[PDB]
Design a protein around this ligand. Structure first.
Ligand SMILES: CCCCCCCCCCCCCCCCCC(=O)OC[C@H](COP(=O)([O-])OCC(O)COP(=O)([O-])OC[C@@H](COC(=O)CCCCCCCCCCCCCCCCC)OC(=O)CCCCCCCCCCCCCCCCC)OC(=O)CCCCCCCCCCCCCCCCC
Ligand SMILES: CCCCCCCCCCCCCCCCCC(=O)OC[C@H](COP(=O)([O-])OCC(O)COP(=O)([O-])OC[C@@H](COC(=O)CCCCCCCCCCCCCCCCC)OC(=O)CCCCCCCCCCCCCCCCC)OC(=O)CCCCCCCCCCCCCCCCC
Ligand SMILES: CCCCCCCCCCCCCCCCCC(=O)OC[C@H](COP(=O)([O-])OCC(O)COP(=O)([O-])OC[C@@H](COC(=O)CCCCCCCCCCCCCCCCC)OC(=O)CCCCCCCCCCCCCCCCC)OC(=O)CCCCCCCCCCCCCCCCC
Ligand SMILES: CCCCCCCCCCCCCCCCC[C@@H](O)O[C@H](CO[C@H](O)CCCCCCCCCCCCCCC)COP(=O)(O)OCC[N+](C)(C)C
Ligand SMILES: CCCCCCCCCCCCCCCCC[C@@H](O)O[C@H](CO[C@H](O)CCCCCCCCCCCCCCC)COP(=O)(O)OCC[N+](C)(C)C
Ligand SMILES: CCCCCCCCCCCCCCCCC[C@@H](O)O[C@H](CO[C@H](O)CCCCCCCCCCCCCCC)COP(=O)(O)OCC[N+](C)(C)C
Ligand SMILES: CCCCCCCCCCCCCCCCC[C@@H](O)O[C@H](CO[C@H](O)CCCCCCCCCCCCCCC)COP(=O)(O)OCC[N+](C)(C)C
Ligand SMILES: CCCCCCCC/C=C\CCCCCCCC(=O)OC[C@H](COP(=O)(O)OCCN)OC(=O)CCCCCCC/C=C\CCCCCCCC
Ligand SMILES: CCCCCCCC/C=C\CCCCCCCC(=O)O[C@H](COC(=O)CCCCCCC/C=C/CCCCCCCC)COP(=O)(O)OCCN
Lengths: 122, 53, 104, 69, 347, 140, 56, 459, 55
């Protein structure tokens, strides 16, 4: 039930291994970063609304800090998520390569020589 | 769930007491020291699923 | 108190015509009302309906209907000039079909 | 109208081809990933589902007051 | 209670949980549970009254029985294998006893009886702590021994928890009991996917904790513990009732809200294991939780209830104490579905 | 115990109707005993004889439902010569629901139970035939 | 004289700017799906002496 | 496709930053402009769809529905501003926000390439509708209506979700193009039967199918006018569109799994048309007429022929326009007299002649007068059904009769006879109401000149 | 007979009635720990006999 916690050579609490540096970092105009900044902006607006302040105008420094914090955390979150997916595919490809008898390459037939049952609509 | 702080820091908070074959005072051996030593050396590093078989 | 609660009485609905005899039914403010009528009429009847209907009417033939008619004309001409049947019951060439060898 | 607001059929045709290729590759990757997960969870010979055992460096390999360990 | 003593007790509760979640030795996990309970009892009685005393007594009896069972399971496991490490239980009887002890600690059915009463008997801050922080340690232990759990027993308890949470929540006018039954149903959802994928368990735990923190903070802000008391909030703080209604919709699991993401991820995972009947029943039963959330939203925000004259005075005063993390909590409780793939960072 | 379930399921569908009925009666009686135990624990009967009477009532109702279901399903299977057909289970379950309605002396309960138990039993038969898993093992 | 009318009518460019931005993003998304540009068996063609791509 | 989505999203800050007396003008003008822009999706290809990107695609089935949604938003705004005048600025902006969010969800729903995204947006449309009904409805029943609107939908859609993820575990994809190209037959098994039911019953509930339709009269009667307009014109079609997408994986099972639904649709079409003959509430009559038309659409989709699919598309568009117009017509009289009883206000042709003309044209399109697209769709479906089995005409023709009988009945009850004497507050029709009726009726008539634009992919 | 009575009776009214009765049965516990802990003992015995004997 625990897939990748026991992966060999895994440091307990790094959050971002050294090998993850081999991957292209997310662009700063990444749509996911833009959505994280939007979440920070919404948090700032809700903070104004709860405190009974002018929602759009009250805390520009506070709203800016909300947006900046959300973007800053989202960058490293995206890096870690991309690294984990890269690890998943790396392990999958290595396992398929090391077990050819479990993933055989079978000759594929053309449609002119496969017999498919025809079901009339009437 | 299990935040493995001990191995990250090399602290050894409670690992000295987990098994029977680990550094007893005055080198007093457990009743089944050899069997546990053999089983641990058999199962080391191959994973629980493979070790069960 | 022979009463259950302190409540405002239900007010009577007010007629927009009373203060604005030509009120268009858009807003209480006459200027906002007139401009709301004007923008509705201009952007629905003048822009969307007329110009949109013209645009849809002159859409280019991406469905390729005249193309299909011309292709059919060419095929009919060629086929009845050489005595070929106008259409074949087989959509695909049988020579590229591999039926199972034995049916019994 | 065609010149101003639209493109030729080639663009949509080949964009469809690219989209179809990406989608088919994703489908085959998903099926292969499920099969790999099943095999690794059944046999335990892969990097995944590697459940901890006892570290062998905890064993004390010193004389034990008794010759028979 | 003295504020320094209160801080010490809170940090002792947290330290017990951390001891549970960093230990590799069964005895230290047991000690962490004992320390957590010992520091937890006075926090429930911080506001002294007969109801708080009764809640603390019921809680202590339940948790002490669970701790006895847990130590018994540890000792049986040691007897059949001279092992103290928390890897995988070697004796099935010990495993059954451990699963029952952890279910009793979590409040899963049929050991759910204490969860509403205690939650009703304590203050809202104590209820927040009890329904959020107290779930971490048993769930972490369950995640560590997931491969050893018998799926039939765990799934039976999970389905019972979902059913009983929905049915019990249908009958409640008090908000603390509503939150307790919601907690029982969510715990059932969490423990249903545990034998298949612990990452889904962690994701559900995080999402539920975020939404529960949002709701408890909103209930503390508008100091309401009953439905009728909450029906006055529209006439003093309409924004609070609007946010509460959106968070309630999220808790019911309706898309595109965040509360939909855990169930969506769990059902899907179960279908990878040829499990269709249980996910179908689970969703159809979570409909009940949605129903009583919707009833609360009807009474609180979607309609306007009659108010009182003295409320006019409350119009002249602001809230003295401000909650720093409430806006972030609300936003995380509602608008995080588009960031679903980030869950890969949890494994 | 699933040993009783195996004892029921080891006998083929439309054969030995008396033994099928006996096994289903045992399963129903066990279910009724568990229900009565929980009911007595959570709602004490204020008397020992009244508790014994309630246990007897619940256990007899459940055992009668089990006997009726098993006997009706086996007889329908053997007479129609159609084993592995969910409609035998539907008929047995709906007869069991009618038995429950008669035992509680309620027409509406009888009809609702007949329909719901019949549908549930037919679904169980379909799951047996197609291999549907309630507690799926962690394959992946 | 234009300051106040701008301050009360600047909301009238939000939707046209949205339309222009959406068109730009559609073009950008188009740029990521050129793997088969001038490569289909039906439309494959020799380039003109001056053009660099068949479509963009 | 983002050239439609982003302006719709921009509608939100535009209405939240507008002056208190400018919200309606700005929202109406810019929604009309968005509809004009969306009108360019009608240029369709034939062979295959317009595939903008990996996420969104447009078909000859999707484009008319998208245009109808974008056109319905300004009409809803026009119809809402009368009874929302006394509302505060913030609550008016919140109402407009609900309408904008509903349009955004529907636009994304009709163009999603992948079935899980379609499902998520399909469920997301629920929340704004529920809020609109239960917050701005007039009567105490609205709350109950909301519950009926909710749990009927979810009880159908939760199984579908399960089926969907199950499919992606075995097929490997839920992209509609991949699903269509790699489609395989369904064998005759109990598991396949239940997967078919899980794939179909959510759209069945949404139609609604006869017997699962009890939520619709409640929800449509208790809703405010914009809620009723969007519920009848667009939301019901979410079922039909969904079916037309998902039946591609259900062959050849649909060959016999469709019999109970066909029987329910034909008989319940007769039943709901007959119910319309004895109805005291004017909105309830319109709701039941919608049920009957949607039953005919269900028959068309279930028999799985090109003529039936074309007829179903045309009938969906035509019914959306006609039912929205009828709801607006009833709401004008309701705002006059504050009652929905059909016999309270009579002889209205004497007092409101132009509104009587609008009533007449709406009633004519409701009974499918040639050459309106209502009859185009109805006749195509009837011809396909006759090919399916010649006895169907007996039911179909019967439905036609009953339809006319209730349509004119409504017209005769509210417009003809003598006026009620004591009702003396019937003011002349406003320009807003007449313009709303015209903006309903003229596009419907113009669609007769170019019917193929609504005939769907099978054309 | 059909829309206002029986179609209401079968799907929505039956569901509401069944859920309400189940809610009343589940939530009507007097709060006495004797009964709860007796049910706990029954549950522990059942789990030891029906799940723990089958492995
Ligand atoms: C490792 C994990 C495992 C751990 C567990 C292991 C345990 C091992 C040790 C066991 C030895 C026990 C030693 C000391 C225990 C202390 C008990 C105590 O202090 O009592 C306090 C408790 C309260 O004391 P009180 O408040 O001062 O007095 C109040 C009055 O008593 C009442 O006043 P009232 O008049 O108002 O009330 C009316 C009356 C009402 O009384 C009743 O209604 C009960 C009568 C039910 C009739 C049962 C039907 C008869 C036939 C069933 C046989 C089944 C097979 C048949 C098959 C089909 C037949 C054809 O009383 C009650 O309400 C009490 C209800 C509780 C009854 C017993 C609870 C057990 C579960 C509930 C189900 C009861 C049976 C239902 C059927 C289920 C299957 C048997 O006393 C009692 O409740 C009654 C006396 C208890 C004495 C006997 C206890 C021994 C049983 C222990 C467990 C049994 C075996 C465990 C496992 C075996 C297999 C592995
Ligand atoms: C989606 C589109 C629309 C569809 C949806 C809408 C329609 C669906 C629902 C419509 C209504 C169906 C409701 C079902 C029954 C509800 C009963 C009830 O509410 O109980 C509460 C209600 C409350 O009772 P209570 O509070 O306990 O005590 C006070 C009583 O009022 C005091 O009662 P009492 O003292 O006055 O007398 C009671 C006593 C005596 O009752 C009387 O006093 C009067 C006599 C009544 C019996 C009438 C039989 C003679 C006529 C029937 C002819 C044969 C059937 C049709 C065959 C057609 C041939 C071409 O009752 C009995 O003993 C009858 C026992 C069994 C005999 C009838 C059962 C036959 C089942 C049908 C088999 C069909 C097989 C498939 C055929 C396929 C080929 C066509 O019970 C009643 O009062 C009703 C009693 C009558 C029950 C039998 C009537 C059922 C008729 C057929 C049902 C089949 C439809 C459902 C099929 C799916 C099921 C799996
Ligand atoms: C067929 C004749 C062709 C004539 C050529 C020119 C036609 C121009 C018409 C343009 C469309 C009309 C606009 C619709 C809204 C009306 C606006 C309004 O408020 O009027 C006030 C306006 C000002 O009068 P007022 O004194 O100030 O006060 C009016 C009071 O409200 C009281 O006013 P009222 O009581 O006098 O009633 C006003 C009038 C207006 O109310 C209506 O009911 C007219 C709407 C027709 C029925 C619509 C639904 C039924 C489905 C048919 C769909 C047809 C669409 C075709 C394409 C349309 C393109 C937009 O209602 C009627 O007069 C009786 C209607 C009965 C006509 C039955 C038609 C059955 C089929 C006829 C052939 C259709 C296909 C032709 C080709 C076939 C093969 C050759 O009154 C008029 O001007 C009368 C309207 C003209 C009568 C049109 C009758 C036939 C035209 C049908 C469509 C034209 C097709 C053109 C293609 C070439 C042929
Ligand atoms: C409602 C949405 C969720 C909100 C959750 C709260 C957000 C605030 C959390 C603050 C972030 C800091 C936490 C971690 C920082 C450094 C610590 C790091 O080293 O820990 C690593 C762990 O990394 C963390 O898990 C990453 C946390 C990121 C959580 C985001 C996932 C959310 C799901 C998708 C929804 C989108 C959320 C949007 C964000 C605002 C160690 O890995 P490991 O010791 O081996 O794992 C232990 C458990 N195992 C072994 C059993 C697996
Ligand atoms: C001679 C008289 C008869 C002529 C009638 C002509 C009919 C056409 C008129 C109707 C207008 C058509 C509706 C507009 C929909 C088009 C939207 C979209 O498709 O156009 C985009 C292009 O944008 C266009 O600019 C659309 C702008 C249309 C905006 C309409 C606003 C009109 C409102 C009128 C306001 C007047 C003043 C108001 C006073 C208050 C395409 O994006 P792009 O990817 O680049 O193009 C790809 C093709 N390329 C590569 C060849 C370039
Ligand atoms: C009130 C006063 C009454 C008295 C005065 C009356 C005056 C006369 C009125 C009657 C006029 C009758 C005109 C009859 C039509 C003649 C012209 C007609 O045939 O044009 C058609 C063209 O019609 C258009 O194709 C269809 C118009 C579609 C309108 C769409 C409106 C925009 C959408 C609005 C929102 C809709 C929302 C719902 C959408 C589903 C023909 O198309 P086609 O023969 O092929 O074209 C061949 C030549 N082309 C290709 C170069 C054009
Ligand atoms: C209010 C409106 C709600 C919506 C209504 C939706 C309608 C859905 C109904 C589904 C239609 C058919 C379902 C399955 C197809 C055949 C069903 C069965 O009766 O046919 C026979 C099936 O044989 C038996 O009859 C078994 C079915 C009997 C048990 C089911 C209980 C039916 C009682 C009615 C319950 C009410 C259902 C609706 C509840 C609301 C055919 O025999 P056979 O060809 O050999 O087996 C075919 C299946 N194989 C191929 C997999 C082997
Ligand atoms: C096994 C169990 C599975 C459970 C499946 C749950 C189905 C989903 C529907 C759950 C709705 C439960 C609502 C309920 O029962 O409440 C009873 C309630 C008690 O009254 P209150 O709401 O508290 O307010 C007034 C009293 N002071 O009674 C009512 O008023 C009901 C009014 C609204 C009912 C709406 C139900 C609509 C359901 C449509 C049918 C589909 C149901 C779901 C299952 C589908 C069938 C497979
Ligand atoms: C408004 C009310 C609408 C109510 C809709 C309810 C009906 C929905 C349809 C059924 C829902 C669940 C179906 C599950 C999704 C199908 C996916 C699938 O293919 O799984 C099947 C499994 O199918 C099932 O297990 C489903 C059995 C039913 C479980 C729940 C029973 C609920 C009541 C059943 C009848 C009601 C359904 C139809 C109601 C019609 C609408 C009223 C096969 O998978 P495997 O296990 O791998 O087997 C392969 C080898 N054969």
């Amino acid at each position: 039930m625990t897939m990748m916690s026991g992966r060999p050579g895994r440091v307990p609490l790094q959050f971002l291994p050294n090998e993850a540096r081999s991957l292209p970092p997310p662009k700063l105009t990444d749509p996911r970063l833009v959505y994280m900044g939007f979440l920070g902006y919404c948090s700032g607006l809700i903070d104004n609304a709860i405190r009974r302040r002018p929602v759009v105008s009250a805390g520009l420094h506070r709203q800016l800090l909300y947006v900046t914090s959300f973007v800053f955390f989202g960058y490293y979150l995206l890096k870690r998520q991309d690294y984990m997916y890269a690890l998943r595919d790396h392990d999958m490809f290595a396992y398929v390569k090391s077990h050819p008898e479990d993933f055989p390459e079978k000759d594929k037939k053309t449609y002119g020589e496969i017999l498919e049952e025809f079901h009339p609509v009437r | 769930p299990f935040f493995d702080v001990q191995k990250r820091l090399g602290l050894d908070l409670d690992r000295w007491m987990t098994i029977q074959s680990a550094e007893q005072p005055h080198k007093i051996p457990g009743r089944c020291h050899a069997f546990e030593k053999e089983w641990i050396e058999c199962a080391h590093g191959i994973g629980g699923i493979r070790a069960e078989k | 108190p022979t009463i259950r609660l302190q409540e405002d009485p239900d007010p009577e609905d007010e007629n927009l015509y009373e203060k604005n005899p030509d009120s268009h039914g858009y807003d209480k403010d006459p200027i906002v009302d007139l401009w709301n009528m004007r923008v509705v009429f201009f952007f629905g009847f003048s822009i969307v309906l007329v110009l949109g209907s013209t645009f849809v009417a002159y859409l280019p033939d991406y469905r390729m209907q005249e193309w299909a008619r011309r292709e059919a004309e060419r095929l009919v001409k060629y086929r009845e000039a050489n005595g070929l049947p106008l259409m074949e019951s087989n959509c695909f060439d049988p020579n590229k079909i591999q039926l199972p060898e034995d049916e019994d | 109208i065609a010149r101003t607001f639209y493109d030729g059929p080639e663009k949509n045709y080949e964009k469809t081809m690219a989209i179809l290729q990406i989608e088919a590759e994703k489908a085959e990757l998903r099926l292969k990933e499920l099969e790999v997960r099943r095999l690794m969870r059944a046999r335990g010979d892969g990097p995944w589902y590697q459940y901890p055992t006892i570290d062998k460096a905890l064993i004390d390999h010193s004389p034990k007051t008794t010759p028979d360990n | 209670m003295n504020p320094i003593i209160y801080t010490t007790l809170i940090m002792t509760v947290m330290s017990g949980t951390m001891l549970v979640m960093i230990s590799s030795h069964w005895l230290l996990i047991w000690i962490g549970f004992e320390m957590n309970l010992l520091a937890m009892i006075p926090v429930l009685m911080k506001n002294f009254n007969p109801r708080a005393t009764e809640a603390a007594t019921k809680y202590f009896l339940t948790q002490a029985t669970a701790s006895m069972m847990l130590m018994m399971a540890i000792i049986i496991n040691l007897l059949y294998s001279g092992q103290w490490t928390i890897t995988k239980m070697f004796n099935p009887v010990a495993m059954t006893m451990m699963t029952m002890a952890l279910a009793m600690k979590l409040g899963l059915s049929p050991f759910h009886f204490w969860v509403p009463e205690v939650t009703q008997g304590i203050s809202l801050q104590a209820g927040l702590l009890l329904l959020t922080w107290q779930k971490l340690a048993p769930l972490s232990v369950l995640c560590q021994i997931s491969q050893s759990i018998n799926p039939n027993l765990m799934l039976t308890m999970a389905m019972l928890s979902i059913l009983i949470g929905g049915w019990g929540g249908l009958n409640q006018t008090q908000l603390r009991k509503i939150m307790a039954y919601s907690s029982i149903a969510h715990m059932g959802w969490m423990t249903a996917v545990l034998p298949y994928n612990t990452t889904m368990t962690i994701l559900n735990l995080l999402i539920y904790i975020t939404m529960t923190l949002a709701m408890f903070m909103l209930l503390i802000h508008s100091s309401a513990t009953t439905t009728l008391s909450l029906s006055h909030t529209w006439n003093k703080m309409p924004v609070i009732t609007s946010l509460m209604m959106v968070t309630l919709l999220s808790m019911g699991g309706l898309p595109p809200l965040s509360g939909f993401m855990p169930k969506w991820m769990i059902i899907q995972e179960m279908t990878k294991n040829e499990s269709i009947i249980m996910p179908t029943l689970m969703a159809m039963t979570a409909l009940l939780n949605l129903y009583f959330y919707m009833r609360l939203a009807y009474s609180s925000s979607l309609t306007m209830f009659p108010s009182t004259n003295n409320m006019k005075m409350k119009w002249q005063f602001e809230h003295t104490k401000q909650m720093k993390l409430l806006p972030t909590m609300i936003v995380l409780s509602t608008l995080v579905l588009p960031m679903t793939p980030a869950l890969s960072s949890l494994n | 115990a699933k040993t009783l379930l195996h004892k029921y399921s080891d006998i083929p569908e439309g054969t030995e109707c008396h033994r099928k009925a006996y096994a289903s009666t045992s399963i129903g009686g066990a279910t009724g005993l568990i229900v009565s135990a929980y009911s007595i624990a959570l709602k004490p009967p204020a008397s020992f004889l009244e508790g014994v009477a309630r246990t007897g009532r619940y256990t007899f109702t459940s055992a009668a439902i089990g006997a009726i279901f098993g006997l009706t399903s086996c007889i329908s299977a053997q007479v129609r010569e159609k084993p592995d057909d969910p409609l035998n289970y539907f008929i047995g379950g709906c007869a069991g629901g009618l038995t429950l309605g008669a035992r509680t002396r309620s027409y509406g309960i009888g009809a609702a139970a007949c329909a719901y138990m019949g549908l549930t039993a037919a679904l169980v038969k379909m799951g047996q035939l197609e291999g549907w898993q309630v507690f799926a093992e962690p394959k992946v | 004289n234009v300051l106040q009318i701008v301050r009360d009518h600047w909301v009238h460019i939000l939707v046209p700017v949205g339309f222009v931005f959406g068109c730009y993003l559609d073009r950008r998304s188009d740029e990521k799906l050129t793997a088969f540009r001038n490569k289909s068996l039906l439309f494959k063609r020799e380039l003109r002496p001056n053009e660099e791509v068949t479509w963009k | 496709m983002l050239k439609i989505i982003i302006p719709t999203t921009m509608l939100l800050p535009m209405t939240w930053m507008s002056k208190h007396n400018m919200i309606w003008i700005n929202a109406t003008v810019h929604s009309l402009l968005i509809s004009l822009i969306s009108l360019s999706l009608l240029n369709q290809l034939g062979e295959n769809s317009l595939n903008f990107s990996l996420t969104f695609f447009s078909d000859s089935l999707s484009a008319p529905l998208l245009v109808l949604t974008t056109w319905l938003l300004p009409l809803m705004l026009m119809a809402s501003q009368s009874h929302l005048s006394k509302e505060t600025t913030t609550r008016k902006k919140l109402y407009i926000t609900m309408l904008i969010l509903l349009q955004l969800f529907l636009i994304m729903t009709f163009t999603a390439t992948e079935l899980i995204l379609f499902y998520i947006l399909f469920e997301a449309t629920l929340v704004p509708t529920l809020i609109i009904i239960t917050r701005w409805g007039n009567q105490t029943e609205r709350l109950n209506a909301g519950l009926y609107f909710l749990f009927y939908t979810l009880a159908g859609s939760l199984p579908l979700l399960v089926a969907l993820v199950y499919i992606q575990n075995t097929t490997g994809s839920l992209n509609f193009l991949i699903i269509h190209y790699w489609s395989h037959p369904l064998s005759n098994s109990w598991s396949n039967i239940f997967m078919w039911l899980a794939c179909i019953m959510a759209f069945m509930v949404k139609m609604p199918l006869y017997g699962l339709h009890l939520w619709l009269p409640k929800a449509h009667v208790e809703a405010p006018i914009a809620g009723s307009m969007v519920l009848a014109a667009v939301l019901l079609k979410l079922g039909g569109y969904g079916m037309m997408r998902i039946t591609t994986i259900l062959n050849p099972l649909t060959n016999y799994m469709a019999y109970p639904f066909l029987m329910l649709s034909m008989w319940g079409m007769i039943m709901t048309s007959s119910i319309c003959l004895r109805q005291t509430d004017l909105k309830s009559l319109i709701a039941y007429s919608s049920v009957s038309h949607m039953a005919l659409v269900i028959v068309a989709i279930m028999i799985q022929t090109p003529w039936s699919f074309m007829g179903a598309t045309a009938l969906m568009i035509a019914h959306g326009l006609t039912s929205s117009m009828l709801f607006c017509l009833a709401n004008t009289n309701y705002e006059r007299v504050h009652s929905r009883t059909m016999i309270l206000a009579r002889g209205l042709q004497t007092l409101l002649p132009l509104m009587a003309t609008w009533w007449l044209v709406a009633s004519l399109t409701n009974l499918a007068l040639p050459p309106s697209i209502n009859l185009i769709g109805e006749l195509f479906i009837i011809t396909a059904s006759f090919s399916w089995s010649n006895i169907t005409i007996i039911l179909m023709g019967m439905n036609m009769m009953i339809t006319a009988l209730y349509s004119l009945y409504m017209l005769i009850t509210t417009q003809r006879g003598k006026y009620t004497h004591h009702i003396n507050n019937i003011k002349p029709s406003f320009t807003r109401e007449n313009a709303l009726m015209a903006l309903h009726i003229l596009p419907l008539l113009l669609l007769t000149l170019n019917p193929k634009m609504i005939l769907g992919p099978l054309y | 007979l059909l829309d206002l009575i029986w179609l209401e009776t079968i799907l929505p009214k039956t569901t509401s009635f069944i859920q309400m009765k189940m809610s009343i049965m589940v939530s009507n516990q007097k709060g006495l720990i004797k009964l709860y802990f007796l049910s706990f003992l029954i549950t522990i015995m059942i789990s030891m006999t029906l799940f723990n004997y089958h492995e």
